[PDB]
Design a protein around this ligand. Structure first.
Ligand SMILES: CCOc1ccc(C(C)=O)cc1-c1cc(NC(=O)c2ccco2)cc(-c2c(C)on(C)c2=O)c1
Length: 115
């Protein structure tokens, strides 16, 4: 179907806020990765399509998504980037896995209610 921006925002924002409420696990993901500020200069050699919570939130707030799977795609892109770049034993990788667990619990009833 065709989705109105306000409809997508009201339905999907709670799933995004569930990620933000994870503390400390959302902290690596709330703003875009700046490899200079973080001291990880090889980041963009590995992560070619960056994504983060602030970008997703702004896109959802300002109507940049036409349909809900575009939002889901961006969330998983953020997770996949972090699992690709960070080592399996690293703190940031483990934090990512926690966010993905939360997202999987929240997203399916919302997607079913949408469409
Ligand atoms: C270099 C190691 O950091 C990273 C490496 C890789 C990635 C990714 C997303 O692949 C992200 C980080 C990372 C981590 C944290 N915090 C913690 O790990 C933490 C908090 C408490 C305990 O541990 C904050 C920020 C951060 C940002 C993005 O914007 N601001 C502002 C920030 O502070 C970035």
């Amino acid at each position: 179907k065709i989705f109105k921006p306000e409809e997508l925002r009201q339905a999907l924002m709670p799933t995004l806020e569930a990620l933000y409420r994870q503390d400390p696990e959302s902290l690596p993901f709330r703003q875009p990765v700046d490899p200079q500020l973080l001291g990880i200069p090889d980041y963009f050699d590995i992560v070619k399509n960056p994504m983060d919570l602030s970008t997703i939130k702004r896109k959802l707030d300002t109507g940049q998504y036409q349909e809900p799977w575009q939002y889901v795609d961006d969330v998983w892109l953020m997770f996949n980037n972090a699992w690709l770049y960070n080592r399996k034993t690293s703190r940031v990788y483990k934090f990512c896995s926690k966010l993905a667990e939360v997202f999987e619990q929240e997203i399916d009833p919302v997607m079913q209610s949408l469409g």
